[PDB]
Structure formats: C-alpha cells, structure tokens
Design an enzyme around this catalytic site. Structure first.
Site, mmCIF file in Angstrom:
data_model
loop_
_atom_site.group_PDB
_atom_site.id
_atom_site.type_symbol
_atom_site.label_atom_id
_atom_site.label_comp_id
_atom_site.label_asym_id
_atom_site.label_seq_id
_atom_site.Cartn_x
_atom_site.Cartn_y
_atom_site.Cartn_z
ATOM 1 N N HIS A 58 9.023 -0.034 -7.414
ATOM 2 C CA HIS A 58 9.511 -1.185 -8.145
ATOM 3 C C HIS A 58 10.988 -1.333 -7.953
ATOM 4 C CE1 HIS A 58 5.946 -2.060 -11.020
ATOM 5 N NE2 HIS A 58 5.531 -1.751 -9.820
ATOM 6 N N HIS A 70 -1.466 3.521 -3.355
ATOM 7 C CA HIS A 70 -2.638 3.619 -4.194
ATOM 8 C C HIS A 70 -3.525 4.804 -3.796
ATOM 9 C CE1 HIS A 70 -2.051 -0.597 -5.996
ATOM 10 N NE2 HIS A 70 -1.069 0.239 -6.291
HETATM 11 C C1 HEM Z 1 -0.228 -6.020 -3.972
HETATM 12 C C2 HEM Z 1 0.671 -5.105 -4.341
HETATM 13 C C3 HEM Z 1 0.553 -4.229 -5.505
HETATM 14 C C4 HEM Z 1 -0.001 -4.456 -6.748
HETATM 15 C C5 HEM Z 1 -0.580 -5.750 -7.218
HETATM 16 C C6 HEM Z 1 0.116 -3.224 -7.474
HETATM 17 C C7 HEM Z 1 -0.282 -3.081 -8.838
HETATM 18 C C8 HEM Z 1 -0.098 -1.907 -9.557
HETATM 19 C C9 HEM Z 1 -0.499 -1.742 -10.947
HETATM 20 C C10 HEM Z 1 -1.031 -2.890 -11.722
HETATM 21 C C11 HEM Z 1 -0.274 -0.480 -11.267
HETATM 22 C C12 HEM Z 1 -0.581 0.020 -12.649
HETATM 23 C C13 HEM Z 1 0.593 0.205 -13.543
HETATM 24 C C14 HEM Z 1 0.195 0.923 -14.768
HETATM 25 O O1 HEM Z 1 -0.652 0.357 -15.543
HETATM 26 O O2 HEM Z 1 0.686 2.080 -14.956
HETATM 27 C C15 HEM Z 1 0.189 0.162 -10.060
HETATM 28 C C16 HEM Z 1 0.364 1.567 -9.963
HETATM 29 C C17 HEM Z 1 0.935 2.187 -8.919
HETATM 30 N N1 HEM Z 1 1.269 1.619 -7.747
HETATM 31 FE FE1 HEM Z 1 0.860 -0.272 -7.168
HETATM 32 N N2 HEM Z 1 0.610 -2.260 -6.750
HETATM 33 C C18 HEM Z 1 1.013 -2.861 -5.538
HETATM 34 C C19 HEM Z 1 1.697 -2.179 -4.446
HETATM 35 C C20 HEM Z 1 2.141 -0.895 -4.531
HETATM 36 C C21 HEM Z 1 2.943 -0.312 -3.448
HETATM 37 C C22 HEM Z 1 3.483 -1.025 -2.271
HETATM 38 C C23 HEM Z 1 3.134 0.976 -3.821
HETATM 39 C C24 HEM Z 1 3.920 2.042 -3.139
HETATM 40 C C25 HEM Z 1 4.043 2.267 -1.824
HETATM 41 C C26 HEM Z 1 2.511 1.183 -5.034
HETATM 42 C C27 HEM Z 1 2.393 2.392 -5.655
HETATM 43 C C28 HEM Z 1 1.806 2.614 -6.922
HETATM 44 C C29 HEM Z 1 1.526 3.896 -7.530
HETATM 45 C C30 HEM Z 1 1.887 5.194 -7.005
HETATM 46 C C31 HEM Z 1 1.012 3.668 -8.822
HETATM 47 C C32 HEM Z 1 0.519 4.601 -9.853
HETATM 48 C C33 HEM Z 1 1.407 4.883 -10.991
HETATM 49 C C34 HEM Z 1 1.162 6.046 -11.892
HETATM 50 O O3 HEM Z 1 0.418 7.005 -11.386
HETATM 51 O O4 HEM Z 1 1.734 6.123 -13.019
HETATM 52 N N3 HEM Z 1 1.801 -0.006 -5.413
HETATM 53 N N4 HEM Z 1 0.156 -0.776 -8.982
#
Ligand code: HEM
Ligand code: HEM
Ligand SMILES: [Cl-]
Ligand SMILES: [Cl-]
Ligand code: NA
Ligand code: NA
EC number: 1.11.1.21
Lengths: 713, 713
Positions: free
Chosen positions: B77, B244
């Site tokens: 972010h 993810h």
């Molecule tokens: C279309 C693009 C993306 C969408 C719509 C998206 C959406 C989200 C959402 C909704 C969460 C949940 C937040 C929560 O409730 O804690 C999340 C978690 C996360 N996202 Fe994505 N994401 C996107 C791209 C990315 C990218 C590019 C990365 C990194 C390279 C990333 C890495 C992560 C990781 C590691 C988590 C987990 C967080 C945790 O374990 O606390 N995401 N994403």
C-alpha cells in the site's frame, strides 16, 4: 479537490506555524528592511505623496479634487483591524493588501486608494514597504490639509501572505447578530478576541447596532469596540471627529449595482473590485458604503466644523440614495460643497455613529470640550492618530527615520535607556555560579525566566522579559506566575544583584531584567549537567528595568496568559480545545512546530508546570534536561484513557499489569496523537536524539529569551 | 473560524508551493539523509526485522504467529498510491504515516503495522527513514517467508507534512461511480490523473466494479488502474498472485463494529484507529476489509499454491461474515489453516479480483504459464516487487546501500556512465561562442533548453535534460516542443558537437545533453548582453546521452506537457483553469512562488512561448533579459478585457485612447490579479529591481537545468 480539512474539519491546524517561510518571501535571506528604509529619502517620498493628493486619475476621480479623505480612511482601516486581546490585526504588516482584508466590505474602494500609490511604491521599491507607505500616505494627507501630525516611524516590513487570524465564525458577510454563528451572547457581549460588531466591519455599523439608527445604542458598540482596540473615550471621540473632519461617504445609488469584491472578481479586473453599474460607476456616482454624507463645509481642509455642525443643528432621520439610514440637518441652508459640481451645495449630514458623540452623555462632555477648545481637539487627535497607526509596532527601538516623536508615551510600555557598562562573559559566568550556589532550584529558575519571557507576542510585539515587569503589578500577581513562589525567587535574585552591583567599579551593573534571564540560563545549564551534558546557554545582556509608574496596569491585562500549554496551565474552562490554544500560543511566540515540540518536552521535565503538576512530567529524573518526555510518551507499553472525574485528564497504565505510570492533559497527549506532531516527537524520542534534543532545546530557549530584543536587531 | 478558502473556494492555491519549508522540518538545514543512511548497519536492522516477524504483540496479535503478510500489504500500500500521470503518490516520501493516507479505508489496520515498527525506528533514529523502513520491512517479510527478493535501495528521505495531491473530488469515502463528483465518465473512463476506482482505495474494489462480483469486468479495472501505476499484464498478474501467496484478509464480523479512522479518533487512541467492538476486536476477530479469505495452505511460506488453487477448483459466490462478496471452492476439503486455532481448517477462498486472473483471457494465459512454470512466476514477481517499490525513486544515482541490483532496468530511464574527461571552463566558453556564431537566436536556444530540462518532475524524479531524450522519440515530436524548430536547432548543435569532439584528443568529448543546456546558457548570456548587462550563467557538465533503446516510448508519454504556462502553452481545453495548471507545473518543477514568478516573466521576454505567440510578451525588446514583463503588466495605464472570440484571451488597451497594446492569457494576467502573485510581481516591477530580476532569473534558470543532476548531489 477534497482535502484533509474537508475530511477532518476539527483536526488541529499547524499551518499557522509555518506561514511566513523563506519559500514565499521574494527578498533574499539577508534582506534587512531597516537598512533599506534608513537610506530612503523620506522627504522626497512625502513631496511625491503631496503632489499625488491633487492629481486625479479618471479611473477613480478625486472628490473635491483631493484624495486626502480617501487616504485617511485607508490608513485608519489599515490600523483599525487591531485587537488588544491577541495583538492581531493592525497596520504593521500591510495585511490590507491580502485576503481577506483586501475584500472586506468595509474596505470597499480602498483597492483604488492602494492602486493610486503603486507609482510611488514602484519608484522607491524596497526602501519603503507597503505597510509603511499606507500610514505615511495618511499622514501626508493630514499635513497637506493643514493638520500637524505628532510624527511618524518607519520600520513595518512587508509580509508576503495572509496571516491566519480568527475574524469570527459567520459564513455570511456583514451577518446581523443572533445568527447560528453569532459573535454576541448574553447582554450584547462580544466574544473575545473579536473587536468588531459584524463580519467584515472595522468597528461598528455606521447605521447603528444591527442597523437600528439609535445613536445612544450605537455609542455602546463604539465604546466597546474601541476599548478592544486600546482606545479610551477621549481618544475615540478625537479620532472619530478628527477623521470625519475630512472628505465624504459614497452612496449615490443602490448597492445592487456593486459587483464582486476583489478576491471574487474576474482576472481582467487586475486586482480591483466592487465595479459598479451605477451611471459612470465612480466620482460623483460612487458607491462605497451606501451612505451619502459630507460632514464639513471644507472637506479638504482641517477645521473645527464637525463639532460646529454636530452641536449647531438638530438632526432628522433620512435615507441615502441606496436606502441606508443617515441624518440631515433640520432647517439648514445648503452650505456643504458638492464633490464635483461647483454650482451645487448640500445640507449638513451625519451618520448615526457621529451623533453618538453628542447623545451619549460621557461622549458629549468630551465633544463639547473639544468644540469649545479646538486646540485641545487637534492635540488629542494628533496623539491618538499616532497611537492608532503605531500601536502594533512594538518597542521604540524598532522606530525608524527622522520623524519619530521624542516624547515617550505610556502605552509604548517604555524601557529606560541603559547608561552604564554591561556585564561581560566572565561576569555572566560569575553570576550564573552565584545563582546556582544560592540554592534556587532548576525548576524555580526555569519557571521564573519562562514566566518573564513568554508574555511576548509577535502580533504587536508587546511583552517579553525586557523591563523586568514580572516584578511589578499586575504580572507579579497573575495566577500562572505563581505569585508566592515568584516573590521568593525575585527576593533572592534581587540580593544577588545588589551584592554584585555593590562590588563593581566603573559604573558596571546588571539589571534585574537581565539577571532573571541569566538565572534561567543557569537553570537550563544545570539541568543539562544533571543529565550528564555540559552546555553553555547563550546570553545577551542589555535589558533595563522599568518602573511601576512607566507601566500601565490596565493595558498589561491583555497579556496575561490564561492558557499556557508550555506550563500545562488553563485558568478556566474554554470552548476551544487546549491543544488549539497551545498552537495559538506557539504562533504568538513565533515558534515553528518543531520548536514548539522541543520546547514543551523540555519544560515538562525541567519542572516548569504551574503548581508542580505531575501532568506530562514523564520522567523519573525531573530537573534533568533529557528527552524522557518523548521516549515515555511514545512507549506502546503504556495505554491511555480519560479519567471519569475529568475527560481532559488521562491516565497512562502499563498495558500488561494495569499499573498507573503517568497522568497527562490533552496538551501532553496531542504529541502522541496528531500525525504531524507525533512525527516530530518520534525524532526527539529516538535513541540517537539526546544531543539533538539538548541543542535544539537550548536554541529555542535562547530564542524565547530574546524575542523582544530589538535593541540587538 | 471562517477562512479565505471558505469565502473564495475557487481562488488559486499557492500553499502547495510552500509545503516542505525549513519551518516544518525538525532536522537541521544541513541534514543529509543519504549520508546518515550510508553509515546505517543495514544488516543489523534486517536481523531486528526478522526477529520482529514472529514477536506477537497482544494489542494486535500476529495471524499464524507471523506478521509477514501484514507487512507485505503495508509495503505494497505504501508503494501502491503511485500514479504515472503526475508521478505523485508512491512509497518514496513515507506519506502513509500522514493524512489522508494514514486514514484511507484501504489502509485500515496498517496503523498497527507501522506502530509495530516504532521500536526499530526508535533504535536506529535518523539513519533509517520511515519511508525506507516500510519498504525494507516488506522485503524482510518476503525473505523471512522464503522468497528471495531482487534487491533493495535506500535513500527515501522522510517528509514532515502531507503532500497536496488531488485524490479525487468525492466527499464520501468509497463513493460508487456516477455521483455528483464521479471520477468516471463515458465507457468507464477514469479521469486523469487518478489511478484508483473509488476514493480511499489503492487500485480496485476487491468485490468487483462498484461492488458487482464479476471477475471479467473486475479485470478491466485491474488492467486500467495497474497501467496507471506503470504495470503491464505480466507485472500485474505476478504482483497480485505473489502478494496473495501470503497471509489473509480480515472480516470476522460486521463492519459497523469498526470505529473511527486514525485522523478521527480520540486523543487517547494515540494515533491508532479502527477500534473494533466485535468480540476481542483483534486477532481471530479482526475486521479490516470485511472480506474473510485465506489463499493458501501455507500462508506464512512462499508456495506455488495460489495458482494450484485458482485453476484446481471451481468457484462459488458467497458472503463473508461481514456481508461482502467473495468466493469459495466447490466441493473442496478444509485444507486452509486457521490463523489462531490449530483445530479449525477452512475451504480455499478467493476474491473476485483473484478470479480475474483466470477469467480474463489475457491474464489467463499468463496465469497458466506461471502455474506451469513457477520459476518464471517467482522471477517475474521479484522483478515486479522491485519495480513497484522503487518506481518513484528516480535515477539510479539516488539508490543507496549494498543491496542495489546491478542490472539496469528500462523503467529506470537509464543514462550511460560517462567514461571520458569533461569539458572545462575554457571549452565551455569556446562552445558558447560557436553556438552564438552559428546564427541560433536567443529564442531558439532558450526555448530548446527549456524544453529539454522542464520535463523533470520531483514527484517521481523522472525527466530532465540529462539523457538528451529531447532528440529521441517521443519527446522530439511533442507539440509543445515545436518539432520543426527543434529539429533545426538540434541539427546545428549536433554539427557543433561533432566538430568539437573531432578536434579533441585525450578522449575529451561533450555530450549533446550538455551542449543543449550550455547553449541555453549562452542564450541567456546573450539576452543579458542585449539588455546592456554582463551576466554569468552557471553550467555544470557531466550529462550523458541515452539511446533510443534506453528510452521506453510508452512510459515517456506521461511526461508530455499538455499544459506549460511557462511557454504559454495549452494543448487543448481543460476543466481546470490554466493558472491552476501553472501552479501544478511549478510544484512538479520544485519551484516556490517567487521562483515561478521570476522564471515566467523572464521566459516571456526571451521568446520561449510556443509558436512565437505574442501573449504575455510585454516588452518592445524581445530577446533582452529585462524585467519589462512586470513593469508593463502592472501599468495602470492599461485596461484589460476578455475577447469576444475567446474568454481565455485578454486584450490590454490604453485607458485614455482605447488603442491595443498587448494580449495575454489567464497565465499571464493572474500575476496582475492574484493578491499574492501581484505582490511578487510588484517587487520585480519596481524601479530598483532590474539587477535583482537578472540575478534571480539566472538562479532559477540554473536550478531548472540541474533538477535531475543527482550525480552532483
Ligand atoms: C487487484 C489488486 C489487489 C486487490 C483488489 C487486493 C485486495 C486485498 C484485500 C481486500 C486484502 C485484505 C485486507 C484485510 O482485510 O486485511 C488484501 C490483503 C493482502 N494483499 Fe492484496 N490486493 C491486491 C494486490 C495486492 C498486491 C499487488 C500485493 C503485493 C504484492 C498484495 C499483497 C497482499 C497481502 C500480503 C495481503 C494479506 C495481508 C495480511 O496477511 O494481513 N495485494 N488484498
Ligand atoms: C465609529 C467609528 C467609525 C465609523 C462608523 C465610520 C464610518 C465611515 C463610513 C461609513 C465612511 C464612508 C465610506 C465610503 O462610503 O466611502 C467613512 C468615511 C471616512 N471615515 Fe470613518 N468611521 C469611523 C471612524 C473613523 C476614524 C477613526 C477615522 C480616522 C481618524 C475615519 C476617517 C474617515 C474618512 C477620512 C472618511 C472619508 C473617506 C473619503 O473621503 O473617501 N473614520 N467613515
Ligand atoms: Cl494579523
Ligand atoms: Cl505525493
Ligand atoms: Na498585529
Ligand atoms: Na511520487
């Protein structure tokens, strides 16, 4: 574009602390306005202004062939925004040329006045500020029309952006009282720090209160507003009657003909506004206030005809051509000249507020003395015009040029001259060791010096440690100053001073004002030593001691701190959150956000809090200069909750055990809450920051000690 | 308190050019972050971050006992607000810790992430910025969970207040499209410069477009937003699927349980927000996005399970415990671990936007290639994570520390190393004389050098004269650059360069990039000579020439100026007034208001306008470096009106005769309208200002020529 202010409209605003950066200033870092002004040919400026008074421009033709009255009004509005409450407003920064003041309805058509002065500004350039030029022009107007002024001082340096001043909460120009953001409550009580009756007015409504044309009631508003601008009844009568000896008002047709104020006008209007669709829009057809009054039979010459008219006729309520309430002389001949048509004459006319000077019984006694003794009137006016136009200039050391009046006036909070050799660096070291050997504590020494120095406000440049007025009424009795503790410190320092001065030869002596400051220096040095750090705090001698007879007690009342977050002090209970009052105090002290942050965190741990409160004292080595405030505030091991007894006091407990570790106020805890301030606290709370913290604290302490030191400028 | 913004909400805003003053910065004026970072024990910091991964705090317990997913999200972010249109956003200033981004709904609970890093920040102090720390932590999270990163550079200096970025015009968080302030129009066309689909989201809505759970349409928004962040299809799929692979989302109960964001929270929250009333409010009960999805069977370890799941199951639409749309694997066993209870397992789940990587045809091909060749996926993800987190860092010369990848990447706009002696002062004089003897005019030399240097933007540190990309596609064909005139200048300069270089030995040569800038300098010198003045313009050699193969033509398109007030250029017709666009350009050039003012006035008279327009050319000695622009703009002898043909063009006529003297645009005349700008123009239009104007002009000219000169920093 949605902004932070939109999303979080009640979050604290720090932008006021970082107005007036070197980014927005076109002059070089080293430009010194005093040095430029001192070489201006002031006499030549004044000859050019004299000529201008009778050189009419067709885009805003001069009434009677003479711009004097326009310029007097201009200079009187420049000065007239001044409030004693906070020192804000006034002529001393040339703020009339910026928003919002450039577009206040009471400043209508002063944009034309200022534009008339561009060719002279242009010619003399940096050597005469707009700020100075506004007031100089008013004085030259007066002189050209036969009035002998009391004098003039230059030295108002120009500013380059608007000041962030609280002018009221109304969202409509000129809103009458009793709306949702009324500045009035109770029995016609105007809210501090406001000094005018309606948003966008200088003092009062010329029709009468909320437009009710009753001179007696209008007199209440005149007295109250003028008092809030530091003018007493004699001065108020002299200024109103003096001003209204000249020129005329402008209301030749309906106000709907007048268009956008300058800040709303089109780009093509090139910084002017109030373009009028009424006939030619200017000259004989001008509309400014909507009132159409000419006070005297010789509007371009000093006279005693204002009081002759005021008292020589009875007055009838009437309406201008714009529909405004005004007054005309019953049964009078047409003796007043017309501004443009030599074949027309008019009956004498008055505003409601002019009649206040006859129908309010206290004003009437003054006005009659002035009518019977016009020489008294002329002296009072000259003195009041000088006070008006200089009230925010600060100490007499800032006054520049060849026309500065020699008479020292009580309202200047005068400082006697020094007529002896000053102490040198070795003497200062000697005195610091004597102070520390006396048994005065770090807390006492810091607290006393803080109390003396921190009355300074940059708004009008009043206050500060010069003078040693902490020892006098009323400062010595202010609650914030802890009068019984203060008196004990002062006794001890006075005995040090006597013994040092009695030992000298050659006339060398130390003033008490300097010794208060030096002793505070010793306290800060000793606190640094208590933390294991040897530092020398800078000290500059040359303060003098003022007498009680040279101190106007009632004028000094507005300098009392009723909120001083730097001492965790709030005298009573306010609508404005305490953190907002901290940032307001930091602005008056001229502190940036970093400065305010380091200063506060150090004072907490030095014992500067009123009453020895523990609030914010986040250290187990009080009286040592350390960054413990920041380290402890920022420790996530501690959880903070408001107390049941008081929502504005917070307890910090260990998160794991529940054990009570600290207590704090909103002023302490804002440094851990606001995102900008917390960022600053994090620099000072880092493990690499002890040297920085000490250096930065010493720098800001010395800056505060020296705020009023214009003798060293 | 009513403010100027309240009274005149559409008046131009200059505060954005005086953000980031020395007043708000706690570090001394000589602090140099690079030098502090270079002495950081980076290996120590990394050991402490590895430790932190599994040191769970009870106020925000670690999912799976490992904070690695939270941290990756935090770092993605931080980087993820970047827009190519203007270069604004991104990780490079640490802006996630300030408003508004600290409180955007999509950054919920990253406040906890940042707070978990305060002990490290505190321990290492000024030697590691928050900006660097957020990215480094993401890297260490990835490494700790078994993914080897491509590299890491330090050098992101911290900032101390919020940037003024246009994030959109909506007045409601997360507002769906088609409202009164819609960012969308036509066939789902997102307004430039925005790169997100809803106010307060990083890119797209994880439920699908405006909440509609259609993976195929979600893919369109993913493609478009990611392209607006400089990422193509391969990069996009690699980043989403790589991210993810780790961690989980948080939606254990209804969102109504979640309270105020940080900037709205009470002072006792001490900078945190989103406090939840749902069960324990944290850990197993956490609510962040409202979705409840865990992607893989080992959320704390790098795996190939993301694409095994995405392709290995069919997906059924369902709702999280908060009511949000998400997807569950049809008929699957409970193979996904629970974050807190060893006895619970869950079926595989996916977001709408995760399913886009299978159901969009172009992504499907990439995703299948990644599934079949996981080594290709891991390298693509490593490279894209590097790109993501360094895209706003600027030239490689700014990259600090021991982990910078040696490989030169196209997206870095690489500049060859210089491997020869540079021109000295005598060579520069010789080349300036050759340029002036060639016949090139002041206008052509100034114009060309301006065109070359003024592509720089401080937002992402792209552009500038280094590289001589003006001679390549696409810059050589830009309309603002005057392709036919440019070609002629470049041909002449190339022939000077060839002749100089061919006469040398020892290997000394001059780059075209240097010669373009030097020739510009000679134009300014000649223009001063035309005005009767000796002037010296500083020049620093050492620019090199980039090749066409080092110049990505599609990435370079975002740098094209479609408005450049400094050349009086507007490519077409915009909603935003041209003076707003001038201030925006000045901000990207890092100019203060005084700088912008002096610069524009000088360019006008030197002949820098596109097309040789006479608009704002307020001088009868074009190509002479004088302050005529200001003196003539400010002359009250001239009256201005908009033309009948075009309201954005103004004609300036003599007030007395009606005769036409000049024409101007809004960009020209704002300097005579805006009350701050006009105050600046008055200083440079004064009689004492010619030498000041020349000195100030040369300084700002040189500032612009050197904007990208990080090899000299
Ligand atoms: C279309 C693009 C993306 C969408 C719509 C998206 C959406 C989200 C959402 C909704 C969460 C949940 C937040 C929560 O409730 O804690 C999340 C978690 C996360 N996202 Fe994505 N994401 C996107 C791209 C990315 C990218 C590019 C990365 C990194 C390279 C990333 C890495 C992560 C990781 C590691 C988590 C987990 C967080 C945790 O374990 O606390 N995401 N994403
Ligand atoms: C109760 C306090 C005051 C009230 C309500 C007030 C009201 C006004 C109004 C309504 C006008 C006409 C504006 C226009 O239509 O052009 C004006 C004009 C003027 N006032 Fe005052 N005023 C006050 C005090 C003062 C003071 C203290 C001075 C200076 C010592 C001053 C000097 C003038 C002058 C010289 C003019 C004439 C302007 C011209 O000739 O263009 N006034 N006054
Ligand atoms: Cl002010
Ligand atoms: Cl930004
Ligand atoms: Na003031
Ligand atoms: Na950026």
């Amino acid at each position: 574009g949605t902004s932070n202010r939109d999303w979080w409209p009640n979050q604290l605003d720090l932008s006021i602390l970082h107005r007036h950066s070197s980014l927005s200033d076109p002059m070089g870092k080293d430009f010194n306005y005093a040095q430029a002004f001192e070489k201006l040919d002031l006499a030549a400026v004044k000859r050019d202004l004299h000529a201008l008074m009778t050189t009419s421009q067709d885009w805003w033709p001069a009434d009677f062939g003479h711009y004097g009255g326009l310029f007097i009004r201009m200079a009187w509005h420049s000065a007239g925004t001044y409030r004693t409450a906070d020192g804000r407003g006034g002529a001393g920064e040339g703020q009339q040329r910026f928003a919002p003041l450039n577009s206040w309805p009471d400043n209508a058509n002063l944009d034309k006045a200022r534009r008339l002065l561009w060719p002279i500004k242009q010619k003399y350039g940096r050597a005469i500020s707009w700020a100075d030029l506004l007031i100089l022009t008013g004085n030259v107007a007066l002189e050209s029309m036969g009035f002998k002024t009391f004098g003039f001082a230059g030295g108002r340096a120009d500013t380059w952006e608007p000041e962030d001043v609280y002018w009221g909460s109304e969202k409509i120009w000129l809103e009458l009282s009793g709306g949702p953001n009324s500045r009035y409550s109770g029995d016609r009580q105007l809210e501090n720090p406001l000094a005018a009756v309606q948003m966008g007015l200088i003092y009062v409504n010329p029709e009468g209160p909320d437009g009710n044309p009753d001179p007696v009631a209008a007199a209440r508003d005149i007295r109250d507003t003028f008092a809030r601008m530091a003018m007493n009844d004699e001065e108020t009568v002299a200024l109103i009657a003096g001003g209204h000896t000249f020129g005329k008002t402008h209301g030749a047709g309906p106000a709907s003909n007048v268009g956008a104020e300058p800040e709303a006008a089109g780009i093509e209007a090139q910084g002017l506004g109030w373009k009028s669709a009424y006939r030619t829009g200017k000259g004989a057809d001008a509309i400014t206030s909507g009132l159409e009054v000419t006070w005297t039979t010789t509007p371009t010459q000093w006279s005693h005809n204002f009081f002759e008219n005021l008292f020589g006729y009875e007055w009838e309520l009437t309406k201008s051509p714009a529909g405004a309430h005004q007054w005309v002389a019953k049964g009078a001949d047409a003796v007043i000249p017309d501004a443009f048509d030599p074949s027309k004459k008019h009956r004498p006319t008055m505003l409601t507020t002019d009649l206040s000077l006859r129908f309010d019984p206290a004003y009437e006694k003054i006005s009659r003395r002035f009518h019977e003794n016009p020489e008294q009137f002329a002296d009072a006016f000259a003195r009041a015009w000088f006070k008006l136009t200089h009230r925010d200039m600060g100490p007499r050391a800032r006054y520049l040029g060849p026309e500065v009046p020699a008479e020292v006036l009580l309202w200047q909070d005068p400082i006697p001259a020094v007529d002896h050799p000053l102490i040198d660096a070795a003497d200062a070291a000697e005195l610091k060791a004597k102070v520390l050997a006396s048994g005065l504590t770090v807390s006492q020494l810091v607290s006393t010096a803080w109390a003396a120095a921190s009355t300074f406000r940059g708004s009008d440049k009043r206050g500060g440690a010069n003078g040693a007025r902490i020892r006098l009424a009323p400062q010595k009795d202010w609650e914030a100053n802890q009068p019984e503790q203060l008196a004990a410190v002062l006794e001890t320092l006075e005995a040090i001073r006597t013994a040092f001065n009695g030992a000298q030869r050659g006339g060398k002596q130390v003033s008490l004002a300097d010794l208060i400051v030096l002793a505070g220096c010793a306290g800060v040095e000793q606190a640094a030593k208590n933390a294991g750090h040897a530092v020398t705090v800078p000290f500059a001698p040359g303060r003098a001691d003022a007498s009680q007879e040279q101190t106007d007690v009632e004028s000094m009342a507005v300098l009392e701190p009723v909120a001083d977050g730097f001492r965790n002090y709030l005298k009573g209970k306010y609508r404005v959150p305490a953190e907002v009052l901290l940032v307001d105090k930091a602005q008056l002290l001229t502190l940036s956000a970093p400065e305010m942050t380091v200063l506060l965190g150090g004072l907490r741990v030095l014992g500067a809090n009123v009453g020895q409160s523990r609030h914010g004292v986040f250290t187990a080595r009080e009286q040592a200069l350390t960054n413990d405030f920041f380290v402890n505030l920022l420790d996530m091991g501690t959880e903070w909750k408001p107390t049941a007894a008081d929502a504005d006091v917070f307890e910090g407990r260990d998160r794991a055990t529940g054990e009570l570790k600290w207590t704090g106020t909103r002023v302490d805890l804002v440094f851990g809450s606001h995102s900008q301030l917390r960022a600053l606290a994090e620099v000072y709370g880092s493990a690499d920051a002890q040297e920085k913290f000490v250096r930065d604290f010493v720098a800001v302490w010395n800056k505060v000690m020296n705020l009023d030191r214009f003798d060293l400028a």
